[PDB]
Amino acid sequence: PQITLWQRPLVTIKIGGQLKEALLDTGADDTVLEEMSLPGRWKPKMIGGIGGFIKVRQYDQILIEICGHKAIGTVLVGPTPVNIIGRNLLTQIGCTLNF
Amino acid sequence: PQITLWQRPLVTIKIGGQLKEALLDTGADDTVLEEMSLPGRWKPKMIGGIGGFIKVRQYDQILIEICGHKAIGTVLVGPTPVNIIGRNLLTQIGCTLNF
């Protein structure tokens, strides 16, 4: 698509059959999604936040489908206030910033 | 330009004669720049961070020049670990996310 930033660039993502909406954040290196159950084998990971570090669970190789584009990458699942699609997956779908 | 996100999208900004480099962050609603002296009249503003809220100074109407494009917007100046160009100025330069 072409997305303008006059409003927060939220998009619908499909992961786990579950359908969520997330922020395309060129400033986030990682994807952090709200707590959901992903079939997998996870490894612990601490990520920073306002107020402190929270622990999240790291799932590698998850397939996710951002604005209809299949993408394989790691997602971190955890008590995040907002679902973020960071650069590790913006890459795969071919995002660019253009002006 | 067309910027890909295989690496953090840093760019050089000119503000105050001072030349800095900042992150184009579609996930940041505001611009927060490292402490510098901007001629102006400022109003206080608290912004959140890892560990807590920090106080910053809000300058409205500042001219800034992102990847050679003049833009007028508010910048917050403050002890931020990183210079962020958020959506309030990505708009003016005509940024879009494209895939």
Walk me through what this model shows:
- The structure is a homodimer of 99-residue chains.
- In chain A, a hairpin with a 2-residue loop joins strand 6 (52-66) and strand 7 (69-78).
- In chain A, strands 2, 3, 4, 5, 6, 7 and 8 form a seven-stranded mixed beta sheet that branches.
- Chain A has one helix spanning 87-93; strands at 2-4, 10-14, 19-24, 32-34, 43-49, 52-66, 69-78, 84-85, 96-98.
- The first copy, chain A, has one domain (1-99): Beta Barrel (Cathepsin D, subunit A, domain 1).
- By secondary structure, chain A is mainly β.
- The two termini of chain A are 15 Å apart.
- Chain A is built from one helix and nine strands; from the N terminus they run E-E-E-E-E-E-E-E-H-E.
- Helix content of chain A is 7%, strand content 55%.
- Chain A binds chain B through residues 1-6, 8-9, 23-29, 48-53, 67, 69, 84, 87, 90-91, 93-99, and chain B through 1-6, 8-9, 23-29, 48-53, 67, 69, 84, 87, 90-91, 93-99.
- Chains A, B: Homodimer, whose active site consists of two apposed aspartic acid residues.
- Chains A, B: The active site is at residue 25.
- Chains A, B: Residues 1-5, 49-55, 88-99 are annotated as: Dimerization of protease.
